[PDB]
Symmetry: C5
Subunit: 311 residues, 5 copies
């Protein structure tokens, strides 16, 4: 079977729609997500036209192999989608209504700059290649675009699922390609990060700051170095669920800042001890008393600067 012939020289319009049934496995490190959806396609094939009077039927059902069907592919998929044809219906005028249910692993890049208080626009790119006989063009049937209310993406809030109605028309391997952009806007559920990562990091940092109320170097060394090891465990835990980015992320900047604060607290502990041994405890006492205010104040200010730069 060849494509439908044109009445004049107009392109063949394939109306499309994606109805999301499931959205799962958003892998941040892999920058992929899995989707289970309906793909609806509609186009006119005059060769399939019939008179409902002489036929006795108002609609005709067909098998995919019996008629011409446009080769629609997804651009940003790992492997070709797994699809199952649900229905193919032809109306008297020859308007074909195709419906399939598919599952696919989608490759969509993520911006981790504001992580874990980030939002993303996931893309699903639909494409059709033109044939020598005629130019095939994609369109969006907005009445056939949507998502199930039960669609839950673990650790994310689904804001909207819309399509950019105008296709991207360009040449690829000496043939025209029509590309539609389906956009799934999501925002991260940051809740869990506060009691599980943010607050534990602060607690161990505040424990390291008790060294500013102690003159015992041996105890101070234990306090700062042991809390540093606990911080390193949290840093490793955090960075393992993120890919390596060529830019600084919000969490990355915080982690880096905390390393500086631990390093400076070691300098203070070292300086205070050196002075006490040099029989200068009065000078050490002045530094330690200043540190009690300076460290929390500089920590709060540095965080305000960071939050400002990132948000």
């Amino acid at each position: 079977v060849s494509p439908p012939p044109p009445i004049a020289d107009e392109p063949l319009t394939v109306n499309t729609g994606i109805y999301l049934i499931e959205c799962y496995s958003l892998d941040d490190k892999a920058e992929t997500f899995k989707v289970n959806a309906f793909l609806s396609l509609s186009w006119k094939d005059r060769r399939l036209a019939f008179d409902p009077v002489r036929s006795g039927v108002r609609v005709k059902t067909y098998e995919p192999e019996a008629i011409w069907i446009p080769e629609i592919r997804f651009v940003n998929v790992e492997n070709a989608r797994d699809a199952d044809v649900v229905d193919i219906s032809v109306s008297p005028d020859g308007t074909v209504q195709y419906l399939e249910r598919f599952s696919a692993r989608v490759l969509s890049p993520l911006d981790f700059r504001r992580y874990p208080f980030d939002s993303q626009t996931l893309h699903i790119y639909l494409i059709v290649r033109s044939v020598d006989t005629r130019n095939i063009v994609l369109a969006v049937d907005l009445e056939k675009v949507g998502k199930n209310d039960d669609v839950f993406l673990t650790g994310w809030d689904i804001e909207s699922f819309t399509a950019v109605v105008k296709p991207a028309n360009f040449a690829l391997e000496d043939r025209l390609e029509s590309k539609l952009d389906y956009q799934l806007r999501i925002s991260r559920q940051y809740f869990s990060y506060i009691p599980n990562i943010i607050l534990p990091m602060l607690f161990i940092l505040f424990i390291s700051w008790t060294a500013f109320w102690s003159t015992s170097y041996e105890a101070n060394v234990t306090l700062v170095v042991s809390t540093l090891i606990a911080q390193i465990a949290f840093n490793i835990l955090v960075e393992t669920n993120l890919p390596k980015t060529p830019y600084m992320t919000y969490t990355g900047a915080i982690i880096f800042m905390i390393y500086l604060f631990y390093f400076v607290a070691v300098i203070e502990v070292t300086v205070q001890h050196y002075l006490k041994v040099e029989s200068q405890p009065a000078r050490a006492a002045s530094i330690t008393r200043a540190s009690r205010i300076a460290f929390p104040v500089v920590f709060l200010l540095a965080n305000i600067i960071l939050a400002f730069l990132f948000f």
Copy 2:
């Protein structure tokens, strides 16, 4: 083959049944489980009717390709089920009895609020999309719903496998859809959590509390900070088997509370030392003696409040 024609304008009833053979791989983090079951379907096709006296046969066996079979799908599956047709039997009145054995990975959300003392209702949603010729509606044959006695879901107790007999009939993309809810009620075997997680956390907490019977700051710092590191290892171990939730879980609340208790014990250890250095051991002794009772009492009370709020 087209669907059976109606005698009057009634919808076509497809009687369904699921008999669980196996239940395995309940992934908490992924909120998925694997199922191996029988799917039984039954409907009337008058075109397949015969005389049992003339035909000499009481039943006729058919191949799937030879007759019309409703397209039944699962809503909450990763990929389409892997099915093998076991039998297709037609009775003289034309009643078709279809049986297949399938395996599928089911997506079902879990409520971790009461974890690890939680119970879940896992769902298996059966669906049929109506055709242009006629409306297809689902029903439950309770005599064909059940589970194998040997069905074991590692770390869970299987309470019941029932079906909500009334289908959810709704319009989806200008066609009727008939959905059935099969519910598998399970409860977590919390046993192991007590000797492996709960009791070890308490032991290391009680070890940190020996600092209330010591005046040695250096030893106290070692006790509280080393036990905190051991607690962090347990917290990481626990939270790795749970997904990130937009709500507080029972275990999460306990873990958070323990962080506060460790932080307050550091404050006590710090305060006691500051007083001893300031030549005020009498005041420190009063605080340390109070801490010996206050810490276990406040720990027990806070746990009673938490258990009350969650259960």
Copy 3:
């Protein structure tokens, strides 16, 4: 093709045999193992009977599609087996001899009560569902049951591969189902657990007991708390390769007992220090001297009691 018709009303006997070629991937946590084997089936089909004089052949080879073959499935499999028909042969009396080679992931529950000194009976359940026309029942051809000498299951000793000759016949959805139990008896190679887990745990426990020959609280705290952290690493390492059981395992009981011993050694270290500070070293010396004998003696006795209860 329909099943062979009965001479009288007798059920159709399908003789079976499983010859193990490979046994691999015994996953304890998943309670699954992978098998690669031959499945032999044999039954009489009188419609296939012939005269070897007239036909000039003593055996007839057939393609699966050409003749009736019983639908044999495995009960306890993740997904349906991956099978390849090797041969189908018919003798003059109509005795069919079928042979296939298959691979399958088998779900078989394990008893971890005596771990790592445990033995298991892995099961492979063959099943057949009776048809409308006649009742099918399974049997064991013992001459066709066996295993290759090279069959190695990493970390296990293979004791025997036998079949329970009488099937477990029963009704499932108003049809006879004939079930055969193939049992693979295995025992764990416990060797490695001794130098890798058992002896390291004892060494670090004995190191913690050197605190009974020291009066230095700061050193004692370091000894007991550092060895506890090392023990926690071994406990995590051990429990990660085991599933969560609703019963106590031998290793679990040992791990729990060691936690008590560490907790009691902290109590001793704390008590000894409190007395020395209270200017009572004579009383502390009596306790520490008693501990030197009491701890190893109670440890040995508690282990004898545990080994007795579990073995």
Copy 4:
């Protein structure tokens, strides 16, 4: 269908092209990457030639089964590629234009000598085996070689995708083989390694160096040994994402050098203490004062030597 017959004894030229749509999952440890691309093939089949005026059509479309197609394979793939034929077009002279879209996991070795400041040349080898009737030879159509602007390989910069135009024609099992080398030049985005690995390693090293301003052996031991444990954590974290190489890598050399520096700092700490105990603090003070300059200077010089040897 047999291959096209030669006009004279010339080999059959199959013009090739690869257009990269997606590049993902560059696994360093596995030395593999996943590719989703277009494979274009073009060759002359005179049997397929036609008159454009007589046939009325300027281009004829064919199904793969209808015509002869060369068996093209990839040399360095895990499994055979997953391909979907997009188009097959024949021009009047019999020039066939084939296009498929494929996905494949490519095995390509990596040079980790300069890691994480390394660049790689990933290879995709195209191969054809000659037939008994005629010799098949490969060629590159440069107009059909390229990549999508959006092609992003996480943690890498894509420099170029070119093909070595001269094929490697060699005998293999008494038949000609024609191999083409497609080269994807990439360079690692080293950014993240600086704040996440390099700077943390330096901070903990500088903390260990505060022992050169302390006379307290107990504190010094804690400083050097605790920071060594933190370094071991980073070394394990680093080496887990790299395969075991039969050569030294840049990161490996740095890690080894840091071990020496920690070992030498322990020697210093030990020597200083031995002298103080031997009532020689003047000699110890000379060594510790020298160490304050010697350690950072030798560290900087050793790093300059290493960077010179590796770059």
Copy 5:
């Protein structure tokens, strides 16, 4: 299609050959490897004889389904190989030349006794089962056995790929089976183990030995116990990439020996302290001075004995 009939009563010889294209993923823990190779088969089928004058061609090409092909399987594979037929060429006498390219995961046991300085002989077992009509026997065509020069197995050196030319013809389930052994001799690239595992273990052991130059029990306890924890991390790292063996491995023996050395160093540290407290520093000094020589000497001797016993 049935097998070729014999001219006399001779068995049918199937000449074989394996040409390795790729060797990857040698999993030590799983005792598997992945292979991508050519499988060449050759046998005579007189029924396929043709006159090249009448057929117009000197060599016939066939589709697998069109002619009789021996059922060749691999014994030691996880699942049946993934194969793609490259060519089937029949010459006028009826000599068939079959070629396929396959990928398979091979199960081959490994001897870890000399790990990481071990060598292995990986096996690929080819098998054919005889039919009812005639006995099938395998042979090796040495001109069709080999490997690609580029064949790289990460972390291994490939020594040779040869075949044991004499098949193992044996009875299995009342039929002849003909088995060929293809042996891939490999040796481990031990390089990386020296700077990454061996030397770090020695450095931390030497750090623990600085306790023999210290009289400070609290510092000594910190030194020996902290380095023991670092050693435990290396032991876990090492043992995780090895399966549980029912024998002692070279690395296992070293790891066990190091535990003894750490345990004995704790005994020394404990004894030395007990004597100093008992006002006997002269006796302690004699033990500590002896330990400075005894520990490195006994360590070197024990390693010579171990290397001798294993190599």
